[PDB]
Amino acid sequence: ASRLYTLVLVLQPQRVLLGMKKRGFGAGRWNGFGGKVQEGETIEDGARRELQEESGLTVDALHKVGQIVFEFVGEPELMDVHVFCTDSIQGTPVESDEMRPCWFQLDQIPFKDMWPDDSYWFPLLLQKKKFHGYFKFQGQDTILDYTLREVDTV
Numbered sequence: 001a002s003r004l005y006t007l008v009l010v011l012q013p014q015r016v017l018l019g020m021k022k023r024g025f026g027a028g029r030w031n032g033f034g035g036k037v038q039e040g041e042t043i044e045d046g047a048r049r050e051l052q053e054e055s056g057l058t059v060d061a062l063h064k065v066g067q068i069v070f071e072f073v074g075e076p077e078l079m080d081v082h083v084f085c086t087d088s089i090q091g092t093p094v095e096s097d098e099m100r101p102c103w104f105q106l107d108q109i110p111f112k113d114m115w116p117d118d119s120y121w122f123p124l125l126l127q128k129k130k131f132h133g134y135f136k137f138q139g140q141d142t143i144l145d146y147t148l149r150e151v152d153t154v
């Protein structure tokens with residue numbers, strides 16, 4: 001069994017939008033915007049909802065770019081993260097209770113202050129290639145196993 005999550009990257013020709021997580025799971029790391037998918041909403045709907053709640057931004061179209069499955073040792077549910085990207089946003093990003101947003105140049109992505117898996121799959125994201133990933137974590141800092149492959153359909 002798995003639980004559905006979303007992650008949204010606003011990726012524009014020269015820059016990417018990340019949020020510093022201010023509380024809760026992953027506090028203290030820069031990440032895309034996202035969260036749990038609710039009963040009664042599509043994955044895409046959930047992605048737009050979390051983007052709006054965390055940054056105030058709305059989007060015309062979200063594109064599926066990846067799926068990443070996480071195992072945390074000792075936790076029964078796998079995390080099934082559906083990753084989306086967009087290049088056209090509506091509005092200016094603003095800070096929320098959960099996220100403090102900032103733009104980063106593509107050669108200055110703060111990988112040391114991100115989830116360790118990002119260093120593995122972000123290159124594929126930046127090359128506009130679709131991917132399937134799997135990461136086994138012990139705790140929040142240690143990757144024990146992983147797989148990563150490019151796909152034709154996410």
Ligand SMILES: CN1CCN(c2cc(NC3CC3)nc(N)n2)CC1
Pocket residue numbers: 005006007026031032033034035036070079081115117118137
């Ligand atoms: C609600 N959030 C959305 C984003 N998400 C993650 C996780 C992640 N790896 C960690 C599981 C080990 N890496 C990125 N880039 N995003 C976690 C749950």
